Swiss-Prot record, chain E:
It comes from Escherichia coli (strain K12). The keyword RNA-binding applies. InterPro entries: NA-bd_OB-fold, Rib_uL2_dom2, Ribosomal_uL2, Ribosomal_uL2_bac/org-type, Ribosomal_uL2_C, Ribosomal_uL2_CS, Ribosomal_uL2_dom3, Ribosomal_uL2_RNA-bd_dom. One of its GO terms (biological process) is ribosomal large subunit assembly. SUPFAM superfamilies: Nucleic acid-binding proteins, Translation proteins SH3-like domain. Residues 38-47 have a biased composition (Low complexity). This is Large ribosomal subunit protein uL2. GO terms for molecular function: RNA binding; rRNA binding; structural constituent of ribosome; transferase activity; zinc ion binding. Residues 27-52, 220-272 are annotated as: Disordered.
Amino acid sequence: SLSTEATAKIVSEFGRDANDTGSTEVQVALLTAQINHLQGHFAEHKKDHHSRRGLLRMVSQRRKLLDYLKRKDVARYTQLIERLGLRR
Amino acid sequence: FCRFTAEGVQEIDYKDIATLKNYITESGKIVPSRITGTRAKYQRQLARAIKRARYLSLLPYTDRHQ
Amino acid sequence: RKQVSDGVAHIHASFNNTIVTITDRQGNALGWATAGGSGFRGSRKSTPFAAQVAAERCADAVKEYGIKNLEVMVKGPGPGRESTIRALNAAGFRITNITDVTPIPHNGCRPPKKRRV
Amino acid sequence: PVIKVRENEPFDVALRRFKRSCEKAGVLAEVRRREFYEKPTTERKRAKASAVKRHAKKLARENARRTRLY
Amino acid sequence: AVVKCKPTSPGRRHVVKVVNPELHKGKPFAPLLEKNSKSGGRNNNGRITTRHIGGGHKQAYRIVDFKRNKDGIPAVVERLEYDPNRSANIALVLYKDGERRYILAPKGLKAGDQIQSGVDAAIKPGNTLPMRNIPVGSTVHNVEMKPGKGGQLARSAGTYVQIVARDGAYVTLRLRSGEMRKVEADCRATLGEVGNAEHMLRVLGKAGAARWRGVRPTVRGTAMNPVDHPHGGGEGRNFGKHPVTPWGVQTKGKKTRSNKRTDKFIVRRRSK
Amino acid sequence: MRHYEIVFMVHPDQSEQVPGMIERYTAAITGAEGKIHRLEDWGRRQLAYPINKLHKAHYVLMNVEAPQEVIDELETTFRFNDAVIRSMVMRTKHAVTEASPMVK
RNA sequence: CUUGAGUCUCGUAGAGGGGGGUAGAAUUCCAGGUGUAGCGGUGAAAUGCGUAGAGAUCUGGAGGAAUACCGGUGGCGAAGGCGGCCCCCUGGACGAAGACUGACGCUCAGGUGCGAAAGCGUGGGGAGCAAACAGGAUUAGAUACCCUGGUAGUCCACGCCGUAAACGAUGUCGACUUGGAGGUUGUGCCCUUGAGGCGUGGCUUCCGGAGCUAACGCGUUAAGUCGACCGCCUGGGGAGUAC
Ligand SMILES: [Mg+2]
Ligand SMILES: [Mg+2]
Ligand SMILES: [Mg+2]
Ligand SMILES: [Mg+2]
Ligand SMILES: [Mg+2]
Ligand SMILES: [Mg+2]
Ligand SMILES: [Mg+2]
Ligand SMILES: [Mg+2]
Ligand SMILES: [Mg+2]
Ligand SMILES: [Mg+2]
Ligand SMILES: [Mg+2]
Ligand SMILES: [Mg+2]
Ligand SMILES: [Mg+2]
Ligand SMILES: [Mg+2]
Ligand SMILES: [Mg+2]
Ligand SMILES: [Mg+2]
Ligand SMILES: [Mg+2]
Ligand SMILES: [Mg+2]
Ligand SMILES: [Mg+2]
Ligand SMILES: [Mg+2]
Ligand SMILES: [Mg+2]
Ligand SMILES: [Mg+2]
Ligand SMILES: [Mg+2]
Ligand SMILES: [Mg+2]
Ligand SMILES: [Mg+2]
């Protein structure tokens, strides 16, 4: 999983405030970091289907959240996906 | 009776052969929880400990001559 | 020709047959006997009595060696498992230790399939 | 089931201890069960049946057998 | 990787290439080359002594180091190379003192890797140590038979030997044929399996490929005339003979090992 | 850093080599900035069953805070050194410094 | 806006998954010692093995597979499924207090993924078991049941297949509605005075009320009272077959 300090750093970066954790941008960033981290693991372990299920859930959550951002506030969405370098 | 009740044992230690010998039979087999009265969580912990000890030749796998 | 005084009686007691084997304490066999050779076949050799007479025969065979103490190692599930030891004691050895050495696996090889009878 | 005959222990007594030790160990039962391969499904089914029967019997005895039989 | 060639012609349809991009795309280390002219399976009497050999490509001979005598001086693997003279791939290494040498490439071995022969040498792939030093059970390759002679056993692609036992002056080897063989414990042996394991997965796909590898076509004895072969030839396709070599010795199953000098070393002959 | 707990059993004829060995392993851990939370030479001890036909193995216990790379190296050393008959590197959560029941 | 839904902090239990080591018991085989006519098998036999020394017994070695006891109507997982011990990577569930976002939710035709066992491809491996096959019995016959053997397969790697009484024969999500006895795993208070008293969450087994049901039965884990969405049925056969 993602380490505590790293999570805190992500929160500080994208979080309006350092006690802000629920912000959409923060949530998306955290998911993205987790997904990126897990890439190495799944490259190593292609048959870890259960874990890949967890990863997939993460991906789905990120997509749903991102969609929510798009409908709510377009500028924020554009900035966030430029910051993170995520397609669409 | 459940020896660990007086402590509420913090963690069972595989090196504590003195007490694990209460939880193995003459033949080296692990005693059932129903017979010894151990709580289920502790029983699992103890079983793990016994297995580790057996690996380290602290306890025997079986009652045989050596 | 030799004397040892103290032997081991290995009682292999399968469902079909009982094999008794007296040996020196090291492992070297002195004499043996079976219910089959004792004169029992089928339903008759799969009985406690057959085991007893096999034991008697074995004791007689190792009489040359002059064995006085004897520890018995019982193996397998068998009709004898008791008759043999009783017979041996009657035949007149001091039974010192009685040990069960039935080989149980720790979930190892697959057994043969179940009989449909 | 190791036993060693103590000083001034009769043979019959020694035999009794040996039999008791074997029964306690459960060697015969283990061998009999391991004589043939029980399928996993069969093992599960047998376990379920045993549990159901035991529970039902206990309930029947304690609670159902609290009435005047005659 | 293994790559199935697309069926653009009936010549390519069955071809399976084993393509390894880690090999050196370039010319080999010229000091270690030397001339290697072809025989055509003919001996010094000019007679064909082994049938079915002839032609193929020109090939320089790499001077591979099977002896492995640079003890103590640690080398580093520069690059893997294609050797036409063997199924396995070779590795160009660079010894700290400046000498370069070719060695058989073991499994996993790659450029920049560090190797060392000797007694003190660490137990890791590509290191070479007397077989008394190697733990019993270890998989080894390029094994010597006579101390100081130079590795002879397990040189071919993906091959290896198990050190099943060490009793005194001799280690027992489980050779790749399955054979158990006693070998002197002073015999050198390189840790790990010999590389290019996919060599056997290649499929030549056409007659020409064999020709390129210098293999001339085999003619069945039963195709021939009675004067030519002990399987002669009848009207139509007869056979009725027990199979035999061209020189009339039963083939298929008849054992031919005639060697009493070395039977003492053969702990168990291969099976299967 | 993960708290480990190593216990290794040594061939009793090589019991005289044990002090040097302990020093070497500890030295490596410290070199790699590894802490050493407890270190108990239990000494020669009667085995519950014969290992490699030999009885009475020499037990050493070592609870350590080290990096996992160094733990791996230690394990490798154990496996290849034909002196240590058995070993058992076992992860632990905290600084279990208090003395063991076998010394107690 | 914060009650649904999610994020963060700290812990908890777990055969959850992937990779790599290792342990002991047992079977098989191999070599050797002791030893002698039986062993094996069955309802009873025979085939089979053994005087070319078997079976029994002790020592050593090889190798493969599976993890006794613990073990539980116990636990984990979406389901399939998961069981020695150790390490490395890794997913989820749950509780505590708060803090944060602010409806971001539910369901889902097409689509995509996962999916026991058997089966298939390529390369390994092969102890035990065992379709096929062989011999011996039984029998009217016995292409079976029983016995002695025994090859694919069962194991490993990577692909395919894509189905099971894949069952709780019970689609997912949410709300509401009397109880009793347990199991398991958190947590608050009570002096834990002892294993113990009173709460409050999660999962779980049985019994049972109202209600429901053709009945059997289900019964706060509904088959009760309702809402959203999907899947499916419309007499037996022909047929989950033909094209
Ligand atoms: Mg049978
Ligand atoms: Mg030829
Ligand atoms: Mg040809
Ligand atoms: Mg030809
Ligand atoms: Mg012709
Ligand atoms: Mg001729
Ligand atoms: Mg012809
Ligand atoms: Mg012709
Ligand atoms: Mg013709
Ligand atoms: Mg003809
Ligand atoms: Mg777990
Ligand atoms: Mg759960
Ligand atoms: Mg669909
Ligand atoms: Mg399969
Ligand atoms: Mg296959
Ligand atoms: Mg195959
Ligand atoms: Mg069979
Ligand atoms: Mg059969
Ligand atoms: Mg279906
Ligand atoms: Mg199922
Ligand atoms: Mg259905
Ligand atoms: Mg759904
Ligand atoms: Mg009910
Ligand atoms: Mg009709
Ligand atoms: Mg169809």
